[model samples]
Target: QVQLVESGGALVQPGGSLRLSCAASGFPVNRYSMRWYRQADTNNDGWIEGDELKEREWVAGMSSAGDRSSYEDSVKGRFTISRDDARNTVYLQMNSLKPEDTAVYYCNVNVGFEYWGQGTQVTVSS
Candidate 1:
């Protein structure tokens, strides 16, 4: 079995940057791929495929390959996903944030999205 723990600061100034952390245990994090997702506060919809197209919808996700990642076009430039197999951890860095970016970020195991972290609540404001 594998587990993930997500940690990060709660607040960030508008136009600033923030780094969200996900630490793994019980199983090697490197053995499996990790993904990051954010749920919008104003949207409430059923789950959709990560590869599908949605505009400012319920969630957003990115796939990580080593230090490289592919993300939804909506977050393509603003979100970067990376992982450290040696440390059994994953990271999601988002820059140029805005007040609307406030949401709950989560880390999940890729295959079937079975295992997930408790999630970290982040707020972007003045």
Candidate 2:
């Protein structure tokens, strides 16, 4: 089975930055685009016990497809999606963050939430 292992988390101040990593194994990452979404159910509660998207996930705002990408209007300027196919890894870096950015971040392949990450939790606060 294809696998994705994510790393990095944040307990940053508002206006800071965040970096999250997802390394895949058992598949050539370049073969599938990477998707990034913020968990919607938690909404700054600062903790997640691990869960699937279950349809409550945010629209993938920083979708980094092979060679090109797209972004949500609200997320367009604040986040960067990076890919390193040789390492079979993809990343999410967020800038000018706010407390509203606090949530578990999920990364999966061309596939959707079905094959999701354990999601890195980000807490933007004082």
Candidate 3:
């Protein structure tokens, strides 16, 4: 069955950097687009603004040979997303971590996110 799997560390420190991974199987990753997102769970607050980061950005195959990507303002500079055709893996890298960056990161396919990862929980702390 086709699927996407996300993997990453659970903890990180301020000014630190980490790479989250998403592995795709039973399908050609380079043939389609890939997206990255995250969700945050608050202790009691129902859920604050920006708690969910959906497919605000994506990397897709270009007409020529390589891939092209576009990002939203919210994730423009702080995040980087890329794909590896050889390994069928997608990557999400973030630096200068902060406590608020704690969340569950996920990867989704281009077909309206039909296939999604279970998500990798990440927490940024001192």
Candidate 4:
């Protein structure tokens, strides 16, 4: 079975950015595009897909803090999702955040959680 492991919790001062890691094993990540989504139902539910276009109505601004921007054809920007062919790892970045941005993040392959890390909770404070 395929699996993904992510970094642990993060503590950052307000206005700082957090880089979360999600590494996959047991599968060639190149065959399937990686997907990341905010947990709408917990347990890593609601994964974004490359073939299906997310409704524009739920659109949010893009991530400005990252070096590479998400391709609209591939994913929605606010739901920043990126993958690395070389490392067999994918990452999600949340930038320009506030206190409310803090939450548990999970990464999944295909359309659901194959292997999930313990989850990293980011707390914004002084």
lDDT of each: 0.68, 0.71, 0.68, 0.52
Native RMSD of candidate 1 (Å)? 6.0
> Judged by lDDT against the true structure, how good is candidate 3?
0.68
Error of 2 at 43 (Å): 5.4
Which model is ahead, 3 or 4, in terms of TM-score?
3
lDDT for residue 97 in candidate 3, whole number 0-100 = 72
The residue pairs found clashing in candidate 4 are none
Model 3 agreement with the true structure over 44-101: per-residue lDDT tens digits: 2323235354423232222113357756455567777777789988788887776766
lDDT for residue 90 in candidate 1, whole number 0-100: 82
Number of colliding residue pairs in each model: 0, 0, 0, 0
Predictions: Cα RMSD each: 6.0, 3.2, 4.5, 9.1
lDDT minimum window of 10 residues, candidate 3: 55-64
> Which regions of candidate 2 fall more than 4 Å away from where they truly are?
41-44, 49-55, 59-65, 110-113
Q: What is the TM-score of each candidate against the true structure?
A: 0.75, 0.80, 0.75, 0.59
* Model 4 stretches with alpha carbons more than 4 Å out: 38-79, 111-115
Let me know the TM-score candidate 2 reaches against the reference structure.
Answer: 0.80
lDDT of 4 by residue, 36-112 (tens): 43322222223323432222212122132334344333223334556676797777665665554455565555535
Residue 80 of candidate 2: its Cα lDDT?
80
Best by the lDDT measure: 2
Q: Can you rank all candidates by TM-score, best first?
A: 2, 3, 1, 4
Task: Give lDDT tens digits, candidate 2, residues 27-55.
Answer: 67776767887664354456654562454
